[PDB]
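User: I need a structural model of Cytochrome P450 CYP260A1 from Sorangium cellulosum for a docking pre-check later this week. Nothing fancy, just the predicted structure tokens so I can convert them on my end. Input:
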Amino acid sequence: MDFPLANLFFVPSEDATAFGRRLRAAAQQAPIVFDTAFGMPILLRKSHITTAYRDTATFSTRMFQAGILNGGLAAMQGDEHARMRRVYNMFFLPRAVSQYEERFVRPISEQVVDRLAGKPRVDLLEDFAMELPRRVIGELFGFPAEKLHETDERVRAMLRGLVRMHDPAAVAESQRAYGETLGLITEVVERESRDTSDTLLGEILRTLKAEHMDTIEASRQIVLSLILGGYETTSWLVANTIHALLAHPDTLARVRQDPSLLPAAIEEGMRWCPSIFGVLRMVERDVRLDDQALSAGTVVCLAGIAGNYDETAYPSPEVYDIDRKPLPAANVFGGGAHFCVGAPLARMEARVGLQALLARFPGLRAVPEERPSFMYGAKDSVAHGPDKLPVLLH
Ligand code: HEM
Ligand SMILES: N[C@@H](Cc1c[nH]c[nH+]1)C(=O)O
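Assistant: Understood. Predicted structure tokens for Cytochrome P450 CYP260A1:
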């Protein structure tokens, strides 16, 4: 073995900081480790990670060409990638996001939190963090949220093949699950591809055609990204933010009384309890990073989130401190040219949804003695997140 062994991902804890602390401790011992359970090298050194994000010819996203994302944005390189990213970015510009907030997200958030009011105890993971992003996507598609709820097993099977692609069983199951969702995706595209379509998805598909990029594969892939990113991945950001607040009731009270603190609560939450495992790249040629060597063809995990607990940048990093200024730079969206294009929507949903929740329930508090457990792979996902978020509402 070229690298020391590590066990960074497959350790559960009731302490949501355990993952960030493990990443930092490992980074202090070695720049690159081999995670036996996850099954690939993990880059932990900031200089290597930032270098890798910028050198896309050496560290590509081409591993996505072998699976269900082939034909989509993430699998593109170079100028092809830049052209399609410019079109996707149009849908996440500030004015567009503000319109989604007024038209979809705030009203849906109010309905989601309303549905919780008749119960003394609820699980905010299933009944809030997952529900709100699902319903937003259902309304973007002009499509029933209840029908999207039935895809959960398929969504997570799709995702598991996108993170550990050295596992042929996981890859095949991702392909199987995509094939079992293709009927739904096709129906959504065809309905919203009509000239009489009145959805954001309809506008996206028209804009795709006005920008000369409107193949059927492009339409399927934007729908797929909105399901996998817009619903599932966003849910874990909402979940981890809620936990950070529930675990710090004095901070939760401050944020309820001053909702202008919500952006900081979300950004600090991304530092304190990141919801991603890391970010994949493919090494395209033999490369040396200081005294480390990586071989052509190797898929690696960039762990920029190992900097979340760098105490030289963020003193007392195990403290959830929404007052850190400047706010910590987010590492959960990747970096360089591939930095998540959907981040503005995810951030806005977390803010608007939490604003609705905290306003509706002045009594919100974690259930004592039913502590969430945090680990990579929660609910068979590819996120670091809780298994449950039980709360008392009144
Ligand atoms: C509106 C919701 C979302 C949508 C539509 C979305 C969509 C996408 C798309 C299309 C890409 C590929 C970008 C490219 O390669 O140029 C991407 C990448 C990514 N997204 Fe998202 N996403 C969403 C939410 C999130 C959230 C909530 C997180 C994490 C908290 C996240 C983390 C990432 C990461 C880590 C990447 C990889 C970036 C890289 O390779 O450097 N996404 N997303
Ligand atoms: N991993 C899926 C879903 C996702 C979007 N953003 C973060 N995750 C994808 O790359 O599309």
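Before docking, keep this in mind: The longest helix spans residues 216-246.
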